[model samples]
Target: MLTMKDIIRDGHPTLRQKAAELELPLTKEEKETLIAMREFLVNSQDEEIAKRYGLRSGVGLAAPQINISKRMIAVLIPDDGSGKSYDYMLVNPKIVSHSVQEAYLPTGEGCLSVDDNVAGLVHRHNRITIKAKDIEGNDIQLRLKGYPAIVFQHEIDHLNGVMFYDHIDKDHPLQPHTDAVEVLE
Candidate 1:
């Protein structure tokens, strides 16, 4: 049971450094940690369980956020606008392709690692194709869109030592780009 206490905060060196690729046949400990992350995300969304554990709701988490410099991420997308949800434990995820149509969350993005409220629009691709491996080392190829696309890219950026805020335009964080299509509110 990984609690918020186990999560590393902003300014941690581990979060800034690029994570190393996890080897195949993941060790017992690595697998367990990934499971814990998934569970935390699920539990965090349950009102009762969240109150019991004092957990903050989140859609995804990266190994680096837990001080584990490994290329792994767990995402529990409770909804992707299709009245369906998906869970993924991706290892060494990489974007194979992306749509030219861009998008951003108008309300801004948040991270478990970042405590302060940073106001900015983090533009992202509306659709993305990714290649990675599952917990069992099975190759996984996915085409993600909508909220899932945003979540996947957020976690993958962690493996590359890029925070969501890093993509914001510092000079004009709220400036809108006409070239990119903004996801509906």
Candidate 2:
């Protein structure tokens, strides 16, 4: 874990700036940071390690959160009830196609960057097909639905200088989400 010290808060300039695309055959520093970023999610999810290090739990992490303005993200999800899990350290993750139906969490989403509890339904694509690259810069495509789809969008939003809360309508925070499916886990 990079620990809480490595994570930037909402006001950090890097978190709001557009991240630069990563070059294929990532540089040494980039590769190492990407790997460590993935580990951060793992360690955060481990109750013992998280409590020991005062780490906040997280399922996904973007390089921008750590002040690395590069297009990379780590998504670690466990057992989606269907016996499928999505764990990847991806580079340049870009959504190419998505469903018309929207989706949202009943409890909303929390970010390691946003310390205070921000309340609102963050609507996202119910299904999405993305094009991305792995750590080795090999092309990979993912068609995600339900929880995984939301996670990928949440992380990808960071690369574009967007936050989960940005998707919430402040004046209509609790509005009935139309054409949307509720994701509960």
Candidate 3:
């Protein structure tokens, strides 16, 4: 089981490097790494377990954050007013399409790799279609919107060496978008 100690902070050079795409037919070690990342996502979400382990609660983790320069990411998002939560160990996730109208989480975004709070609405696509491979190396597609879409974008950004705050307008970091997705839930 991976712990908070395994998570590298923002200053780590690995976080800035573009993670390489994993080759098909992943090795056993690669598979194990993904499994451990999934476990961190699950454990960090459980209040008691997270407290005991000193895990900062977050919905996503990427390979680069773990000092592995590979394009693997794990996300565990709870019922964001959706009928179901999303828990995925995705490899090479690529957003194929997205909404023209943008969306922003009013509360903004946080990351396990970032210690300080970065206050800003990270503008992102309200909905997206992603194509990727699961940890088992099987292809999968996900159509996501609202908070789910936000979470996926966060994780994918890590693979590209982009942080959530990178999308925020520097001059007016906290500027509000007209259409906020309180998700109409």
Model number with the top lDDT: 2
**In model 1, what lDDT does residue 124 have?**
94
Residue 21 lDDT in model 3? 92
Residues 90-173 of candidate 3: C-alpha lDDT, one tens digit per residue: 998999999887888777788889889988778888999999999878999999988788889989999989988888787888
Choose 2 or 3, whichever is better by lDDT.
2
How many clashes does the backbone of model 2 have? 0
Best by TM-score: 2
lDDT of 1: 0.89
Candidate 2 global CA lDDT score: 0.92
Which is superior by lDDT, 1 or 3? 1
TM-score of 1: 0.95
- Clashing residue pairs in all predictions, respectively, total 0, 0, 0
Error of 3 at 79 (Å): 2.3
Residue 89 lDDT, candidate 2, scale 0-100:
92
Q: RMSDs, each prediction?
A: 1.3, 1.0, 1.6
* Sort by TM-score, top down from the best: 2, 1, 3
lDDT, residue 50, model 1: 92
What TM-score does model 3 achieve against the real structure? 0.94
After superposing all C-alphas onto the true structure, candidate 1 shows an RMSD in angstroms of: 1.3
List residue ranges in candidate 2 displaced over 4 A. none
TM-score of each: 0.95, 0.97, 0.94
Candidate 2: Cα lDDT at 143: 98
